[PDB]
Amino acid sequence: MYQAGGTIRSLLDKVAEQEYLLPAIFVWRPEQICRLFDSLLQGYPFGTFLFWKIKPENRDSYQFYQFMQHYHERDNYHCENVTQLPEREFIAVLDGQQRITALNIGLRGSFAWKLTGKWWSNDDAFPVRRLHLNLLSKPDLETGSMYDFEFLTDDKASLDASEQYWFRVGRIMEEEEDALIDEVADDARLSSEQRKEARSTLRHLYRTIHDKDKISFYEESDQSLERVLNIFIRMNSGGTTLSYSDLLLSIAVAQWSSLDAREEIHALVDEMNRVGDGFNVSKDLVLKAGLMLSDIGSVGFKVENFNKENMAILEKNWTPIRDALLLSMQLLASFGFNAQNLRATSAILPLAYYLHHRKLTASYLSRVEYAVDRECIRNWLIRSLLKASGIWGSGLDTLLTMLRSDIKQSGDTGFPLAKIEATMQQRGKSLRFDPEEISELAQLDYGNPRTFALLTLLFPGFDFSRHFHVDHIYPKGLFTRNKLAKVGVPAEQLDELIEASNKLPNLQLLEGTINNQKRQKMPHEWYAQQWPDVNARQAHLQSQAITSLPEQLNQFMDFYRERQETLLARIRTALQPASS
Amino acid sequence: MYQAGGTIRSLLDKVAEQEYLLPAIFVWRPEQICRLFDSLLQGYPFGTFLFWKIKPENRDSYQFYQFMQHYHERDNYHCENVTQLPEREFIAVLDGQQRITALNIGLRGSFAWKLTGKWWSNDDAFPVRRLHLNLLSKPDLETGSMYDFEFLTDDKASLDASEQYWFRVGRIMEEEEDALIDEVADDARLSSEQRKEARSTLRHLYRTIHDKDKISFYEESDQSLERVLNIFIRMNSGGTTLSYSDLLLSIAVAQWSSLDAREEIHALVDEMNRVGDGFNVSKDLVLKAGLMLSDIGSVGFKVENFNKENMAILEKNWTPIRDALLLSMQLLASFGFNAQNLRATSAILPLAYYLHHRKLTASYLSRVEYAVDRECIRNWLIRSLLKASGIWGSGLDTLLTMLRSDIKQSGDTGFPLAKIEATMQQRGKSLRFDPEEISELAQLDYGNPRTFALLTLLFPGFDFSRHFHVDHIYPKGLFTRNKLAKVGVPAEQLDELIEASNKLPNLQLLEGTINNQKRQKMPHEWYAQQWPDVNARQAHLQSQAITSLPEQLNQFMDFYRERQETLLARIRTALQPASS
Ligand SMILES: [Cl-]
Ligand SMILES: [Cl-]
């Protein structure tokens, strides 16, 4: 069947009573849910959906799932199983799943994502947020946004937003339009001009969902599913549309006399990703690096930059360029980076420009004449990566072309560290750390990608190309609620000790792989038998910012505070910028 | 910038002027184009298209193509490059490519595909067809069809069938509606009752194309492209809509406790395709085989057959089922089959059923107790593949379930050939060949997949799992039109002899690979050099149905005609209905 128009309200009511379901076959980023609601209010139409009608004889023939509603990046990213399996004929959605999920999360659910820089262990790193609309939206002529939608905690919404009036979008499914419009009219915090504007935005939102025929679908049973599914694919977007990424790639490879630049680019990606313990770089990175290493004026990942003259330059230099790219990954692996602990792939671009510039080869990793230069790059890269945010995000393209001029100007004197650091300061991307950034670094968690990076900056000396790991000084296994309450730790200090045992003051770098006999002893026990000479012992331990090793867990927080103090100092000096 | 109105005629005028072009980045089956036109006349709407505007300053920055128009499976199957590049702003179509191509082929172009049973080398196996509509179509209740569209020759369109009035669709782009409707009204082929419904169907077809707003699109320049493409993708089918067959795979994987069904399917498929010199088998075949080998009542490739009860039965029997499937591929390779010469992969299903029924293993290929049985299978299979069509196409599912009962009753006595052939006969699929089929077999071309099969039937005794090939008796290279006139062949006959030189009476099976010294000699020279003893030579020529080996090409047709008669007698004997 064809249904040419239903409301979003009718659609979501069916989702609510589990009459629209999913067959057993992910979710969008919050920013994309917001772009959908903005596009919806602006008037962009939905494409048609496709629904498979399940008769009651078949309720049990197949496994069905429920549309995602309250998304939690940690605790609920999988679709929930059906709980109210209908006993009348119902629907499984074959096309429309992600648009319907976003509608459902925005209007009936929530989104809890991990805060930037925090670790999965942290429980206050996943604040629950709900979709909100700023009833006083004004056209942002940069994003093309007409309505400002945003996922907000309850308190960032309720705060006095100056010039803003935030409205929880889901209220239009819970209250009548009259009650909501009256709330806005009766709010004395709005001016009369603001009240008029808030009112027509709230009406526009309410009625887009409740009055406008936005939803169209085909609806078919088992018997003719095959035929209409084919019709549906034929007449709508059947052969999937290229993303912008894949469009640039196709346009870019079109300009190459090599009969398969597509194959050259994939071989390079997979090669790069097999380096060391594995990386995860994309073809986007390779194409942008193409633009950057060929001295193209713009490194913007934009279709206009992949015209035939620029792709002619890129093809000419493809061998130097894939050589530098591949040597960039080998440098990174030689520092200990892999796919799990490299947060910003864009940092590869200036590294690769440098290696490509000086025409370096894999001997750059061994010869001693380079060791000082290799160490200067490592320190710079790690510091850039220790920033929670604000270095390799927004503003990248202008940062990259300025860093490129600095590297160009350096001839073969080596990595131009002072110049680079000044360019970054000039751009609002200083590698200077302020005291609260320092405190944040000193409480990093085991497994956070910045943690090993920080440790290899604080305690250099290992061959980071060889095996090494981060270990707990007081083994993490000793720290459970049961075990601790019997050594006497008060019941209220129990969660404090457990959280602290997993953080930087209890962390160290160790050569080799995980030692299982170290992890079953108290640290003073383990170090007394590995270092019988009491003087060696206290020099080794001191090299690791370990002064003492209390013999009972009851005194762990004394140890923690003491080493936290030493690490704060060591972090300060390590992150202090040189001068001349 | 949106545009919800647009006629198909406007769209195709832009294609015709080369103002709608393709960016550099396959064409549908003719029956899929026909189904597009049927859906279009039934009211199924087109999804919205995405167009990228190229400003005249960038008309040279990228490579563009023209929409395909006159499709030739051999001589013109990849997009035409741009003649007549617009000097004003123009469009590259980013979404809608395939739907526009189909409109363009149906309304302004043509489709030439290889006739079933013929080979690429034959220049009269690709008759040009153009899209036609039966102005007397009536609802077909078996196909959901309402309008019968079909690609036809001018000759088969000019034929009078009881209620078949074929009208060439492209004429609505070339002539005024008045002229076309008057020709229908003036045609003594139609009764007054029929000219009313033919006029109404011609008008509906004409006006769907010229008056109705069926085309809608977004149009964007470089600047808005990224933003609007992502909106387009989010609001429409954003994830590649799953085909019916990918839906079945997903439905099926979901019901397996833990054999990790998705990659056990793909792994078995890859395994199947690497047997011998390689096959090209589909996951769809593997699923169908699951249904047949587990004795499910229906073997229809329909979603209803993949409920959890059936998938439970399949998972239990998965190991014996993949065993049987791989053994069936190994048996086929032992016959000399591969991806190129196996025309009907459905023939695998009864093979695999049989092999699974008797629980045979790899020793079935070698032990001599099976030699007679393997040869009976090979003989039956080849005969089924020697039919140009009508065996493994339509009607397959009922044939399969009946072949299954025949194999199941055969117990352990061996392949039940007589009963299988009775079954095939009552299904209208006799392995009996009539005189005109015999004559067509006696002139198959070199390279036609049926030629190798026929030869292995007529000349058994090689080790078809070791290397062998088809070779010309009088080498193919001797037969160029310059070379032939020089040995003094009359002008009239020259191309009769070139023709016949590529056909079965000049073909033989030889062990090993191509022998380049044999291909440079007249046959009688080759054989006198290889078989110095004239009596062993006559014996060996006799085994290949060679009576005489004329020494001049001038007598080649005397050889052709003599060996053709010898082959006809062998073929008539090899294909004759058997003893009972
Ligand atoms: Cl940027
Ligand atoms: Cl069938």
Side-chain angles (χ1 to χ4, degrees), chain B residues 270-317:
Chain B
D270 287 36
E271 217 168 329
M272 294 176 69
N273 291 336
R274 284 182 287 89
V275 177
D277 307 307
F279 292 94
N280 189 23
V281 152
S282 162
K283 84 193 174 293
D284 300 4
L285 179 61
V286 170
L287 292 145
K288 199 175 199 70
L291 297 181
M292 210 197 132
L293 265 62
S294 315
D295 287 292
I296 318 288
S298 187
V299 304
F301 193 61
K302 298 257 132 198
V303 85
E304 42 260 64
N305 289 332
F306 294 82
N307 52 49
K308 64 191 58 190
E309 279 112 321
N310 290 2
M311 286 305 87
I313 299 174
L314 256 65
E315 199 186 350
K316 185 40 202 273
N317 309 58

Side-chain angles (χ1 to χ4, degrees), chain B residues 288 393-398:
Chain B
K288 199 175 199 70
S394 290
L396 166 73
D397 273 1
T398 298

